[PDB]
Short mmCIF file of C-alpha atoms in Angstrom, two decimals:
data_model
loop_
_atom_site.label_atom_id
_atom_site.label_comp_id
_atom_site.label_asym_id
_atom_site.label_seq_id
_atom_site.Cartn_x
_atom_site.Cartn_y
_atom_site.Cartn_z
CA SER A 1 -6.12 -36.49 4.66
CA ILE A 2 -9.53 -35.75 3.00
CA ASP A 3 -10.60 -32.32 1.76
CA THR A 4 -13.92 -31.35 3.35
CA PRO A 5 -15.24 -28.24 1.56
CA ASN A 6 -17.89 -26.25 3.36
CA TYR A 7 -20.85 -24.21 1.99
CA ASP A 8 -18.59 -21.14 1.50
CA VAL A 9 -16.68 -22.69 -1.47
CA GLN A 10 -19.75 -24.18 -3.26
CA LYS A 11 -19.89 -21.23 -5.78
CA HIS A 12 -16.12 -21.68 -6.54
CA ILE A 13 -16.41 -25.47 -7.09
CA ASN A 14 -19.45 -24.93 -9.38
CA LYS A 15 -17.31 -22.41 -11.42
CA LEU A 16 -14.51 -25.06 -11.63
CA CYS A 17 -17.11 -27.56 -12.98
CA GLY A 18 -18.30 -24.91 -15.45
CA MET A 19 -14.73 -24.14 -16.61
CA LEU A 20 -14.28 -27.80 -17.58
CA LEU A 21 -17.80 -27.86 -19.25
CA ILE A 22 -16.92 -24.90 -21.53
CA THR A 23 -13.49 -26.41 -22.45
CA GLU A 24 -13.18 -27.86 -25.95
CA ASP A 25 -11.74 -31.40 -25.65
CA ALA A 26 -11.42 -30.88 -21.84
CA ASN A 27 -9.18 -33.29 -19.86
CA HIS A 28 -11.64 -34.83 -17.43
CA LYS A 29 -8.93 -36.64 -15.32
CA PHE A 30 -9.95 -34.61 -12.23
CA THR A 31 -13.72 -34.22 -12.94
CA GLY A 32 -14.70 -37.20 -10.74
CA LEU A 33 -12.81 -35.61 -7.79
CA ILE A 34 -14.10 -32.06 -8.56
CA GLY A 35 -17.69 -33.35 -8.85
CA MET A 36 -17.26 -35.12 -5.46
CA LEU A 37 -15.88 -31.90 -3.96
CA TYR A 38 -19.04 -30.12 -5.30
CA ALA A 39 -21.29 -32.77 -3.63
CA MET A 40 -19.34 -32.35 -0.33
CA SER A 41 -19.68 -28.51 -0.46
CA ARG A 42 -23.47 -29.02 -0.98
CA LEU A 43 -23.64 -31.46 2.01
CA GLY A 44 -21.34 -29.15 4.06
CA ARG A 45 -18.16 -29.89 6.10
CA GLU A 46 -20.08 -31.05 9.25
CA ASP A 47 -22.36 -33.54 7.41
CA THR A 48 -19.47 -34.79 5.20
CA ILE A 49 -17.24 -35.64 8.23
CA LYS A 50 -20.33 -37.20 9.91
CA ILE A 51 -21.05 -39.45 6.85
CA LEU A 52 -17.39 -40.68 6.67
CA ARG A 53 -17.02 -41.30 10.42
CA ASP A 54 -20.45 -43.09 10.50
CA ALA A 55 -19.40 -45.22 7.52
CA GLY A 56 -16.34 -46.33 9.54
CA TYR A 57 -13.70 -44.28 7.65
CA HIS A 58 -10.93 -42.54 9.72
CA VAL A 59 -10.83 -38.87 8.61
CA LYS A 60 -8.14 -36.12 8.90
CA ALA A 61 -10.27 -33.17 7.69
CA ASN A 62 -8.53 -30.53 5.53
CA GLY A 63 -10.14 -27.07 5.57
CA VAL A 64 -10.91 -25.66 2.12
CA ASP A 65 -10.41 -21.87 1.60
CA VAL A 66 -10.17 -19.57 -1.42
CA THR A 67 -6.71 -18.00 -1.97
CA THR A 68 -5.44 -15.57 -4.64
CA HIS A 69 -2.47 -16.94 -6.56
CA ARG A 70 -0.28 -14.68 -8.74
CA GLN A 71 1.13 -16.43 -11.86
CA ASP A 72 2.86 -15.29 -15.12
CA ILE A 73 0.89 -16.37 -18.25
CA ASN A 74 2.09 -15.09 -21.68
CA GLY A 75 4.40 -12.49 -20.07
CA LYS A 76 1.55 -10.80 -18.12
CA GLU A 77 1.06 -11.45 -14.35
CA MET A 78 -2.39 -12.91 -13.62
CA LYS A 79 -4.46 -13.32 -10.43
CA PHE A 80 -6.21 -16.65 -9.97
CA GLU A 81 -8.71 -17.63 -7.34
CA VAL A 82 -7.78 -21.17 -6.22
CA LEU A 83 -8.88 -23.57 -3.46
CA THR A 84 -6.55 -24.91 -0.78
CA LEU A 85 -6.91 -28.61 -1.69
CA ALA A 86 -4.58 -31.52 -0.68
CA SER A 87 -6.09 -33.63 -3.53
CA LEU A 88 -5.79 -30.92 -6.29
CA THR A 89 -2.65 -28.74 -6.88
CA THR A 90 -2.69 -24.92 -7.54
CA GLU A 91 -1.05 -25.70 -10.96
CA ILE A 92 -3.93 -28.09 -12.04
CA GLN A 93 -6.59 -25.56 -10.95
CA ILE A 94 -4.87 -22.66 -12.81
CA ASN A 95 -4.42 -24.83 -15.97
CA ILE A 96 -8.15 -25.63 -15.87
CA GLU A 97 -8.85 -21.82 -15.82
CA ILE A 98 -6.23 -21.11 -18.59
CA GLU A 99 -7.68 -23.76 -20.96
CA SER A 100 -11.29 -22.57 -20.28
CA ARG A 101 -10.31 -18.90 -20.97
CA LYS A 102 -8.89 -20.11 -24.40
CA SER A 103 -12.26 -21.82 -25.15
CA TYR A 104 -14.17 -18.73 -23.91
CA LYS A 105 -12.22 -16.38 -26.28
CA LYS A 106 -13.04 -18.77 -29.20
CA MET A 107 -16.76 -18.51 -28.23
CA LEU A 108 -16.59 -14.65 -28.17
CA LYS A 109 -14.99 -14.71 -31.63
CA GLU A 110 -17.84 -17.01 -32.80
CA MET A 111 -21.05 -15.50 -31.24
CA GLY A 112 -20.12 -12.26 -29.39
CA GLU A 113 -20.82 -12.12 -25.62
CA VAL A 114 -21.99 -15.43 -24.22
CA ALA A 115 -25.54 -16.00 -22.79
CA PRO A 116 -25.74 -16.96 -19.04
CA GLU A 117 -26.61 -20.66 -19.76
CA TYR A 118 -23.47 -21.06 -21.97
CA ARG A 119 -20.99 -19.63 -19.41
CA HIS A 120 -18.67 -21.42 -16.94
CA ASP A 121 -20.42 -19.67 -14.01
CA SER A 122 -24.05 -20.88 -14.81
CA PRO A 123 -25.47 -22.08 -11.46
CA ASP A 124 -26.27 -25.60 -12.72
CA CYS A 125 -22.70 -26.65 -13.91
CA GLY A 126 -21.91 -28.66 -10.75
CA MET A 127 -25.28 -30.47 -11.04
CA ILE A 128 -24.66 -31.22 -14.74
CA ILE A 129 -21.41 -33.02 -13.68
CA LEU A 130 -23.25 -34.83 -10.85
CA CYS A 131 -25.85 -36.10 -13.43
CA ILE A 132 -23.08 -38.23 -14.97
CA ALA A 133 -22.12 -39.43 -11.38
CA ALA A 134 -25.86 -40.44 -10.95
CA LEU A 135 -25.65 -42.59 -14.08
CA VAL A 136 -22.38 -44.20 -12.94
CA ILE A 137 -23.82 -44.98 -9.46
CA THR A 138 -26.73 -46.88 -11.07
CA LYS A 139 -24.33 -49.06 -13.14
CA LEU A 140 -22.15 -49.72 -10.03
CA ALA A 141 -25.41 -50.71 -8.16
CA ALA A 142 -26.67 -52.94 -11.08
CA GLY A 143 -23.36 -54.89 -11.41
CA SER A 144 -18.77 -52.64 -17.99
CA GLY A 145 -21.90 -50.38 -17.87
CA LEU A 146 -19.92 -47.53 -19.57
CA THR A 147 -21.55 -47.94 -23.09
CA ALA A 148 -25.01 -47.65 -21.40
CA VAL A 149 -23.92 -44.57 -19.36
CA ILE A 150 -22.82 -42.65 -22.55
CA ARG A 151 -26.02 -43.56 -24.46
CA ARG A 152 -28.31 -42.80 -21.53
CA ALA A 153 -26.39 -39.46 -21.04
CA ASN A 154 -26.75 -38.29 -24.72
CA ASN A 155 -30.56 -38.70 -24.46
CA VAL A 156 -31.24 -37.38 -20.91
CA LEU A 157 -28.59 -34.55 -21.15
CA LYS A 158 -29.32 -33.45 -24.73
CA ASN A 159 -30.00 -29.75 -23.84
CA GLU A 160 -26.94 -29.60 -21.56
CA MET A 161 -24.62 -31.16 -24.23
CA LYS A 162 -25.91 -28.49 -26.67
CA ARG A 163 -24.96 -25.80 -24.06
CA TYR A 164 -21.49 -27.26 -23.18
CA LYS A 165 -18.66 -28.39 -25.53
CA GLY A 166 -16.80 -30.03 -22.57
CA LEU A 167 -19.83 -32.17 -21.55
CA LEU A 168 -18.16 -35.39 -22.78
CA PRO A 169 -20.09 -38.30 -21.18
CA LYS A 170 -17.40 -40.96 -21.91
CA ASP A 171 -14.61 -38.95 -20.18
CA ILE A 172 -16.74 -37.74 -17.26
CA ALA A 173 -18.21 -41.29 -16.64
CA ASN A 174 -14.71 -42.80 -16.74
CA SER A 175 -13.49 -40.13 -14.23
CA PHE A 176 -16.36 -41.03 -11.82
CA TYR A 177 -15.78 -44.80 -12.23
CA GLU A 178 -12.11 -44.13 -11.46
CA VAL A 179 -12.86 -42.04 -8.26
CA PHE A 180 -15.45 -44.50 -6.89
CA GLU A 181 -12.99 -47.41 -7.45
CA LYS A 182 -9.96 -45.50 -6.04
CA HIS A 183 -11.89 -43.75 -3.17
CA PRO A 184 -14.96 -45.89 -2.19
CA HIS A 185 -15.85 -43.45 0.64
CA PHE A 186 -17.08 -41.10 -2.11
CA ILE A 187 -19.88 -43.64 -2.88
CA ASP A 188 -21.27 -43.06 0.68
CA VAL A 189 -20.91 -39.26 0.24
CA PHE A 190 -22.64 -39.30 -3.16
CA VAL A 191 -25.54 -41.49 -1.98
CA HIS A 192 -26.21 -39.21 1.06
CA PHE A 193 -25.96 -36.18 -1.25
CA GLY A 194 -28.44 -37.72 -3.75
CA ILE A 195 -30.97 -38.79 -1.04
CA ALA A 196 -30.85 -35.28 0.50
CA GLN A 197 -31.03 -33.52 -2.90
CA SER A 198 -33.94 -35.58 -4.35
CA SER A 199 -36.04 -34.44 -1.34
CA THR A 200 -35.81 -30.68 -2.36
CA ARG A 201 -38.91 -29.43 -4.24
CA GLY A 202 -38.80 -27.52 -7.55
CA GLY A 203 -35.69 -25.73 -8.66
CA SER A 204 -33.86 -25.96 -11.98
CA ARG A 205 -34.25 -28.25 -15.01
CA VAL A 206 -30.90 -29.95 -14.15
CA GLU A 207 -31.81 -30.38 -10.41
CA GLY A 208 -34.94 -32.14 -11.72
CA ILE A 209 -32.96 -34.30 -14.20
CA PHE A 210 -30.56 -35.33 -11.39
CA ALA A 211 -33.47 -36.28 -9.02
CA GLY A 212 -35.01 -38.51 -11.72
CA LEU A 213 -31.65 -40.13 -12.55
CA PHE A 214 -30.89 -40.73 -8.84
CA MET A 215 -34.38 -42.22 -8.12
CA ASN A 216 -33.76 -44.70 -11.01
CA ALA A 217 -30.93 -46.45 -9.00
CA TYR A 218 -33.83 -48.22 -7.10
CA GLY A 219 -36.74 -48.37 -9.65
#
């Protein structure tokens, strides 16, 4: 049973990436999976299932929808927008939002309202996560390469690290290494995503950084 998010939940998954990126000392245990879900929502359900079936994997596709979950946090009832995922519980998703809201309040207290580029909903958060996945893919293709991933990430993602407290290269790289080892079918998904993406012209600074990083896995 593999979650196959479609284009409709792309905005939500990007927001989930952003929530982790704004979290001080964020637990990146699920970032590899979340980043892969972002890549799949960018490729779309149809292309994702096609890639897996073509690669020889047997796939029981799970539809991904947005549902409103009511939960009591600090005595007050709260409404959370969550995704119907077999791989990621409602509890984990809500805890990611709770922890990010704690970080966000700390930011308000520090600088007043937060600029678009420093928020959890900035359109390039998913791509920032996938930049780490691009570095990991290169070191899985070249042959252990974790020290090199961190150092290459601090240089290439210097502006992004300045924008996001939760952009922790060591933790994110480890989470991607872990998912590609545990679920090798994600390697095929990522590679198709990266080939397709690096074809697109212009766009954001981060889309450009990703394309350069991805192209480097060849020369």
